[PDB]
């Protein structure tokens, strides 16, 4: 019975979906697919597609059946074909597929757009299994594609798309007809799809892309979802369609994105931000239009945006803005961090505590940014070098929390370059440095900073009166240090003493002579490194100093030269 | 790949669900009832608001922004006049494809059904299903056009009718 | 950084386990509610009141918890009274009471100097009682106090407390005399001695562990007494608990130095006397002077004891011992032989880390200071597989100690065999270098095999940066002893650098220095090396350039004096030669000139700074 056939089918599908006796359902599913009624053919097909596996008569009947159904035009032929095609798609045997294709062909010849749509979609699933079918069926597609109906076109398209994924060669043959169809579409969805497809065909066949792009953009321009505002974008960005010939397309797409990016919801943003950045790598002009969007994205809360922005910011900068932005990021990260690092608030207006929010490794990037800003071009214009100096010391503080050592390294190298230049600022830097060194926080994690500080002071110990306490600092801290640092400190101090001697004319002052003695005692302490290399490296300097002492005795001014006299001597003795 | 399509009435009644790949067969029904509740809490403008959810968010308040993810399953919801459509997709199909396919499915359903009733959708579960598939096939939505989609459904109905005990 | 570390713990902390103390009271077991009382105030009252009751038993319960409140620093809380009451009550004749009370006293002192004083007075009265069980504990707290004013008391006490024959008291009277002897020299030392003595001679672990923790202090200053007392201590350790042993280590480290028989008449006639060992003078007989820690069975017994402790299976005791075993040692301590056998024995036994290192170390330090004691253990320390990087590293230093000239071949065969064969860790290779450095120091005829072995490793392998830096440091040492083998060593290294214009930055550094250093031996040749380097410096890394300088520099020097008058250059007067008119400025200069110019082209300041000077001085003589 036709009515029970339909009912069985509903329930049969439930049993067949279990991995249950399909024999009981098959007979029915088959006689059902053999019943001319278009509805039964529809449901039957859905079930058989789940059940057909293994039983031969089942499948066999199902096939020979779908044929008779397809063969006759059928006149509610739209549905009959339509479903029967879907159905056949999910059954696969070569015998079946063989029939199916010959059937889809006849079905494509139905007038009614409904039928023309399904037949197209079906040929999609089928072809995915049995290519011989496609072969005999292609010729028809070309005849159907030329139908006046916009839905049929939309379908022929989708199908040609899948088949492009598998066969592109046949469908690059039909692409021209695809263009002509899209040219006649008024519908927003049909436009969106035809776009996805052409994108797929474009990866294979630029000729299509060129012909189709201009059909898209006229289509997006006429539709407002926004849905195509995203789609055309993803397609434009993908086919790599874009290539520039396609900028115009991309433009409209971007303009639609920019409008959206410009709503505070991460769902739309992220999608745009990504699409933007990507576009920019591809289209600088767009970027310049989207500076504002970027700057705004800096205060965005979305982890992918923030990261995507910083990468954009990096490319976009105004100096006054830089200096400001730096200070701004400093506070953000003390308050944007955490949220999904860990918890989980609800995101409303309400939490008065706000959920808040950064990843975990975004902190490191933040600092890096600061340093970059100071060095791009020559923030020769941090006008206020002071601030930079401060910031640098500050960042060093927070990073002590993170480490990543490299955060801390970059900060140091930069500091050195700052102090070197900018003799003013030295006092601030020295005062801080001196304290930072004896303030333990630098020793924690931070050998690099120490290495730099060491150099800085030798250069500027000339500002400070008591170049004695400084050097007694540094000398007390040397034993607390890593090998890299130790190697540095040693090397620095020596680089310094050479300076004082140049400036000491105060009197030479006797004190400088005493201080050299101290440095000596210290370096002896580092000759006690476990690794022979480092050890030998230090012991080398210890001896060096003891020398400078003898030099100052003979002269005042002549000291730098004197040191280059003895020091190398010692050095050679040891090495010799 | 869409692994599943969900149709629900404005009053949250499930009615259809498509599942392309193996997923729990029984829980599917239940899961569909759960993700209904959330739909009701979301606002009409935030209609559907695809509900992404960590799973433990199926009736879970460990996280304040309770939502239902159906474990690793993104749920896209769309609200239309009176029907809602939920689509469960895998993380590998494009979100847009999923969204569009939904939006389209909607306009189609409206035109496909002159006066959709929760009941008319039930009986015509297969029909509704077909539309969904057609839209999908060869990865392709091949008619997208709301005018065609409308007929398409009618066509399928005609066929199925002609076959109906194999269908009804 | 600290975040993750903390979380990992915290996370488990909280829920760990069933909220602590709220589940602590709620589900406490029978006495599962105390958690909320004394947890939420036992209360001082429950204390004081119980102290002002006159009965030694009641002062006990009150003394128990009473220790808690004090521990809370509830600061508000006269602590003086509890302190006082408990002090007067200490004079009670009950032992349990005395115990608690002492526990307390120790707390107060942890925070406050005045009170610390009272607590001491009490312990005096009770110490003057004939009861040994009390006089003990009581004297104990007097010691865990940290302080110095607590001496004019603890004394008159400790006096009568030694004069008691009891072991309990004898243990405690040591703690006191001590933790009190640190701060009271003027009124105290007369007695604080004739005491600690008779004492130390007790058996009870809580008595010994105490006199120890004691003697370790008082003596910081009045060490004559301490001695005759320190002995039993070292003896006692051999009979005792692992805790009571570790403590004796820290002390044995502190007291001898604190003492060392400050020379005053120092009887160098005590035993076999080095620093004279006193026994106490006010003691009888045969004067034993001071320096006595260096000399006196106390210092010595320290080493023997340390051993037993090592034999005793407790690693802590084993390390702390090895540490002091080497620190004191007049080496005559280390030729124990015991340290050796026991060491090597422990080594294999030890699976405890602080130990292996100490163990393997000992082996070396001990071989060095005593070879003949290891020879039976040679084939033994052919490395054990389980062991760490430092371990295999120490194995090398051992072989280096066992060599003779006639036996040397037997050994070396093993060494090289290790580098190549063992699966040696990187660090091992580094050490193997520091060792062989000391091995050839002994033989010359055999040294060639040693050095050659080292070079061959470097010349050939592009070795790891760490290793390269190491080897370079070593080769620097051997060259220092074996200047004949030295010349080759340098030439070989030069060639390697000359080919490798790519080498490693750290390698070039070492390789260069070595060449400065070796130049003394035959600084006539070294220019040959520096020649190639210069020619090719211009293409090098910075640090590498720095060293290359100082070392060009040195090489130049050694010979200025020897070059200068020799270098006062092309002055030909120097190609004339006394001793070191090494073909001098010319050969050396031709090299430096290149070097300097090359260093200037490096980055670091020190590199250039030295380079600049080296040239200036070298040039001008």
């Amino acid at each position: 019975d036709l009515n029970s056939k339909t009912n069985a089918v509903l329930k049969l599908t439930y049993l067949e979906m279990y991995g249950f006796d399909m024999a009981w359902c098959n007979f029915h599913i088959l006689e059902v697919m053999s019943s001319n009624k278009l509805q039964q053919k529809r449901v039957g097909y859905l079930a058989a597609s789940q059940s057909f596996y293994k039983d031969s008569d089942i499948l066999m009947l199902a096939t020979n059946l779908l044929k008779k159904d397809l063969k006759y035009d059928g006149n509610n032929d739209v549905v009959k074909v339509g479903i029967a095609l879907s159905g056949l798609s999910t059954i696969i045997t070569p015998s079946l597929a063989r029939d199916i294709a010959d059937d889809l062909f006849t079905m494509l010849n139905s007038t009614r757009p409904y039928i023309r749509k399904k037949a197209i979609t079906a040929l999609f699933k089928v072809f995915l299994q049995y290519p011989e079918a496609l072969r005999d069926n292609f010729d028809k597609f070309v005849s159907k594609l030329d139908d006046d109906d916009i839905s049929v076109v939309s379908a022929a398209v989708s199908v040609i798309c899948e088949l492009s994924k598998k066969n592109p060669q046949p469908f690059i043959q039909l692409s021209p007809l695809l263009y002509e169809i899209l040219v006649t579409i008024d519908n927003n969805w049909i436009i969106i799809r035809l776009l996805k497809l052409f994108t797929n065909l474009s990866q294979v066949e630029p000729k299509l892309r060129a012909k189709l792009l201009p059909k898209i953009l006229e289509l997006m321009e006429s539709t407002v979802a926004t849905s195509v505002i995203y789609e055309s974008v993803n397609c434009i960005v993908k086919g790599n369609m874009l290539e520039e010939d396609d900028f115009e397309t991309a433009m409209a797409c971007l303009e639609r994105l920019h409008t959206f990016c410009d709503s505070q919801d991460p769902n739309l943003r992220y999608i745009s931000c990504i699409l933007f950045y990507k576009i920019g790598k591809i289209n600088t002009d767009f970027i310049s239009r989207f500076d504002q969007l970027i700057i705004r994205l800096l205060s965005d809360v979305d982890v992918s945006i923030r990261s995507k922005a910083i990468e954009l910011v990096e490319g976009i900068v105004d100096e006054d803005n830089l200096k400001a932005i730096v200070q701004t990021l400093m506070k953000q990260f003390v308050d944007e961090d955490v949220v999904i690092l860990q918890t989980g608030s609800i995101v409303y207006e309400k939490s008065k505590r706000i959920p808040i929010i950064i990843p975990e490794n975004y902190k490191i990037k933040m600092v890096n940014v600061i340093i970059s800003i100071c060095s791009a071009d020559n923030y020769s214009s941090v006008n206020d070098f002071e601030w930079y100096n401060a910031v640098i010391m500050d960042l060093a503080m927070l990073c002590q929390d993170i480490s990543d050592k490299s955060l801390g390294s970059k900060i140091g190298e930069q500091f050195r370059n700052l102090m070197i230049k900018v003799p003013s600022m030295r006092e601030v830097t020295i005062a801080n440095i001196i304290k930072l060194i004896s303030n333990d926080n630098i020793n924690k994690q931070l050998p690099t900073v120490l290495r730099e500080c060491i150099w800085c002071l030798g250069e500027f110990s000339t500002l400070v009166e008591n170049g004695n306490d400084l050097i007694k600092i540094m000398t007390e801290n040397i034993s607390y240090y890593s090998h890299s640092v130790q190697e540095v400190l040693i090397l620095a101090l020596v680089k310094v003493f050479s300076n004082w001697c140049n400036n000491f004319q105060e009197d030479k002052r006797f004190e400088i002579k005493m201080v050299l003695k101290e440095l000596i005692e210290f370096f002896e302490n580092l000759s006690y490194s476990s690794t022979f290399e480092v050890q030998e490296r230090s012991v080398e300097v210890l001896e060096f100093l003891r020398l400078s002492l003898e030099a100052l005795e003979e002269d005042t001014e002549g000291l730098p030269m004197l040191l280059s006299e003895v020091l190398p001597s010692f050095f050679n003795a040891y090495e010799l | 790949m869409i692994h599943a399509v969900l149709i629900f009435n404005k009053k949250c009644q499930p009615r259809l669900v498509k599942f392309y790949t193996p997923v729990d067969l029984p829980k599917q029904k239940l899961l569909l009832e759960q993700v209904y509740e959330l739909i009701s809490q979301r606002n009409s403008d935030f209609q559907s608001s695809f509900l992404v959810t960590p799973p433990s968010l199926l009736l879970s308040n460990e996280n304040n922004n309770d939502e239902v993810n159906n474990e690793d399953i993104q749920i896209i919801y769309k609200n239309y006049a009176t029907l809602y459509f939920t689509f469960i997709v895998d993380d590998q199909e494009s979100e847009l494809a999923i969204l569009d396919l939904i939006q389209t499915f909607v306009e189609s359903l409206d035109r496909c059904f002159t006066e959709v009733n929760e009941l008319d959708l039930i009986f015509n579960w297969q029909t509704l299903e077909s539309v969904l598939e057609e839209i999908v096939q060869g990865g392709m939505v091949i008619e997208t056009n709301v005018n065609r989609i409308v007929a398409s459904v009618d066509e399928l109905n005609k066929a199925a009718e002609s076959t109906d005990s194999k269908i009804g | 950084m600290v975040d993750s570390i903390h979380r990992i713990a915290s996370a488990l902390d909280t829920a760990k386990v069933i909220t602590r103390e709220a589940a602590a009271v709620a589900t406490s077991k029978l006495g599962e509610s105390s958690y909320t009382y004394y947890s939420q105030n036992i209360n001082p009252q429950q204390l004081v009141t119980l102290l002002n009751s006159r009965n030694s038993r009641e002062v006990r319960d009150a003394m128990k918890r009473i220790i808690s409140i004090m521990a809370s620093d509830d600061d508000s809380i006269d602590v003086q009274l509890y302190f006082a009451d408990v002090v007067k009550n200490i004079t009670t004749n009950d032992t349990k009471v005395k115990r608690l009370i002492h526990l307390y006293l120790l707390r107060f002192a942890e925070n406050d100097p005045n009170l610390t004083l009272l607590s001491i007075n009490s312990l005096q009265k009770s110490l003057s009682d004939s009861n040994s069980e009390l006089r003990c504990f009581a004297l104990s707290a007097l010691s865990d106090m940290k302080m110095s004013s607590l001496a004019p008391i603890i004394l008159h006490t400790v006096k009568k407390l030694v004069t008691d024959p009891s072991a309990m008291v004898r243990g405690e009277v040591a703690l006191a005399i001590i933790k009190l002897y640190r701060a009271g020299k003027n009124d105290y030392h007369e007695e604080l001695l004739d005491i600690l003595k008779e004492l130390m001679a007790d058996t009870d672990p809580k008595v010994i562990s105490c006199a120890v923790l004691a003697y370790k202090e008082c003596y910081a200053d009045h060490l004559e007494l301490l001695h005759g007392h320190f002995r039993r201590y070292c003896r006692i350790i051999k009979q005792l608990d692992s805790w009571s042993q570790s403590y004796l280590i820290e002390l044995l480290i502190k007291y001898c130095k604190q003492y060392l028989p400050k020379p005053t008449v120092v009887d160098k006639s005590s035993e076999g006397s080095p620093r004279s060992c006193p026994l106490p003078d006010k003691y009888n007989e045969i004067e034993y002077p001071s320096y006595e820690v260096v000399n006196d069975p106390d210092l010595d017994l320290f080493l023997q004891s340390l051993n037993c402790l090592i034999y005793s299976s407790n690693p802590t005791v084993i390390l702390s011992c090895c540490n002091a075993l080497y620190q004191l040692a007049s080496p005559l301590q280390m030729k124990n032989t015991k340290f050796i056998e026991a060491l090597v024995r422990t080594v294999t036994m030890t699976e405890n880390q602080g130990n292996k290192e100490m163990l393997l170390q000992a082996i070396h330090f001990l071989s060095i200071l005593d070879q003949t004691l290891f020879l039976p253990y040679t084939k033994k320390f052919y490395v054990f597989p389980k062991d760490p990087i430092v371990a295999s590293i120490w194995k090398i230093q051992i072989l280096s100690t066992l060599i003779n000239e006639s036996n040397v071949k037997e050994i070396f065969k093993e060494l090289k065999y290790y580098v190549a064969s063992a699966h040696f860790p990187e660090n091992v290779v580094i050490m193997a270098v520091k060792s062989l450095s000391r091995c050839g120091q002994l033989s010359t005829s055999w040294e060639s095999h040693v050095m050659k072995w080292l070079i061959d490793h470097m010349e050939s392998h592009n070795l790891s940066a760490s290793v390269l830096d190491a080897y370079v440091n070593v080769i620097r040492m051997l060259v220092q002893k074996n200047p004949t083998k030295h010349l080759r060593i340098i030439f070989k290294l030069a060639d390697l650098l000359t080919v490798q214009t790519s080498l490693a930055d750290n390698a070039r550094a070492g390789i260069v220095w070595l060449f400065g250093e070796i130049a003394s031996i035959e600084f006539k040749i070294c220019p040959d090396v520096l020649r190639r380097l210069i020619q090719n410096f211009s293409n090098e890394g910075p640090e590498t350039r720095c060293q290359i300088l100082v070392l060009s520099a040195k090489l130049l020097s050694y010979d200025i004096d020897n070059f200068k008058q020799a270098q006062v250059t092309g002055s030909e007067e120097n190609n004339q030669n006394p001793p070191y008119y090494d073909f001098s400025g010319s050969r050396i200069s031709q090299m430096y000139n290149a070097v300097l110019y090359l260093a200037k082209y490096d980055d670091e300041f020190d590199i250039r700074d030295r380079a600049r000077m080296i040239s200036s001085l070298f040039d001008s003589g």
Binding site: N439, D440, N441, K444 | - | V2, I5, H6, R7, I8, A9, S10, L12, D13, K16, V17, R20, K64, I67, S68, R99, L100, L103, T203, P205, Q239, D241, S242, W243, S246, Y247, E250, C308, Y311, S312, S313, P315, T316, S320, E341, R345, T348, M349, T350, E351, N352, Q353, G354, N355, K356, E357, K380, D387, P388, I389, V390, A391
Partner: protein
């Protein structure tokens, strides 16, 4: 001030962490991968959260909780060790291994506070875990080294606290150092050199641990361990590509006096590290025994022969059979570097050094059979590391 104590494992893994109210979160550590070097560290931050790591875990655990302030390093080492010992007793003292730690991690935390406060039948069960590094050279197995670790425990059933004397004997091996447990007394005079006095705990008490090095002992005592201490394994090559024959006899001739071996576990490792366990397929065809169980773990490349305590007095469980290196691949090159056969014996009522006890009794001015009885079944344990016979 907060004091936090954490028991780490060998490779610094933290196992337990103790909190003390309110709210709370390099040369040696560089080394600890090796099991015993953890002591001082400074985790350090500027806040006075200084924690000193003196580093001792006993029984494979690392404990290292830093204090909140001052305290001193070595001072913290003492508090740490004490913490170590109370936990085993709480567990029962049988074995605080990292595994147990985790489980008992809570009881350990509770202790830390409790310690932090802390202001009739007798039996001597001498358990003796030997470990001996034998080197086969010349046909006989020559005990090269070895360590017999005797723990002497005693399980009592008195009612009060009488004293015990235990007479130990030398099995002419100068027995040299018996180490005695904290509830045990070894007055140099009062108790002869071979005897010790024990005071109750309720608790199992290790009465004496003893370590003896077999190399000189065995040579000094002349003992080819016939009964025990020398299991002569003869691995004969003349092998074919798959077989070999090794004869190992563990005669209980000198162990006749001894009760048996609560559990002799012979793990023969056949190096498979350098040969690929598939190469080592080996089979042990014949195992000579009268009272134990030989199951082979071939796959893993291991012998395990477990002799149950059941063999009594002098029966000689012959150890012999054949090792056949069966190969599933041909890629076994008939090489099995034959490496270290560690035999860990555990003899329960034997003396690790030869600390043989003829008899034990309460000793208070009393006479024998003044009313005190003698029990059976203290149980000590003893472990070192482990015998090794090299071939």
């Amino acid at each position: 001030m907060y004091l936090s104590f954490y028991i780490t494992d060998t490779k610094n893994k933290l196992i337990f962490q103790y909190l003390l109210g309110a709210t709370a979160p390099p040369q040696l550590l560089e080394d600890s991968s090796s099991d015993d070097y953890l002591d001082h560290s400074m985790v350090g931050r500027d806040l006075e959260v200084y924690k000193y790591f003196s580093v001792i875990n006993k029984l494979n655990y690392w404990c290292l909780a830093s204090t909140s302030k001052s305290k001193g390093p070595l001072d913290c080492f003492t508090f740490l060790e004490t913490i170590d010992r109370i936990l085993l007793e709480y567990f029962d003292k049988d074995k605080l291994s990292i595994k147990k730690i985790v489980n008992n991690y809570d009881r350990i935390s509770l202790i830390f506070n409790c310690c932090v406060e802390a202001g009739n039948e007798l039996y001597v069960d001498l358990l003796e875990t030997f470990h001996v590094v034998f080197e086969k050279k010349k046909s006989h197995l020559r005990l090269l080294t070895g360590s017999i670790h005797g723990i002497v425990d005693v399980r009592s059933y008195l009612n009060d606290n009488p004293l015990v004397a235990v007479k130990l004997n030398t099995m002419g091996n100068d027995i040299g150092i018996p180490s005695l447990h904290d509830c045990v007394e070894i007055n140099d005079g009062v108790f002869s050199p071979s005897n010790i006095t024990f005071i109750p705990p309720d608790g199992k008490f290790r009465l004496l641990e003893y370590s003896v090095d077999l190399s000189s002992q065995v040579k000094q005592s002349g003992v080819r361990m016939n009964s025990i201490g020398l299991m002569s394994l003869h691995f004969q090559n003349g092998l074919g590509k798959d077989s070999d024959e090794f004869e190992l006899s563990l005669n209980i001739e000198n162990f006749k006096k001894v009760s048996q071996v609560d559990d002799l576990k012979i793990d023969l490792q056949f190096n498979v590290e350098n040969a690929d366990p598939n190469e080592i397929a080996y089979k042990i065809k014949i195992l000579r025994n009268t009272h134990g169980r030989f199951e082979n773990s071939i796959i893993m490349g291991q012998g395990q022969w477990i002799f149950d305590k059941s063999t009594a007095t002098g029966t000689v469980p012959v150890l012999r059979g054949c090792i056949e290196y069966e190969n599933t691949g041909p890629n076994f090159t008939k090489k099995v570097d034959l490496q270290t056969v560690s035999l860990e014996y555990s003899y329960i009522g034997q003396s690790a050094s030869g600390i043989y006890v003829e008899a034990i009794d309460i000793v208070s001015g009393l006479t024998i059979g003044k009313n005190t009885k003698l029990y059976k079944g203290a149980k000590y344990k003893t472990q070192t590391g482990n015998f090794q016979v090299r071939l």
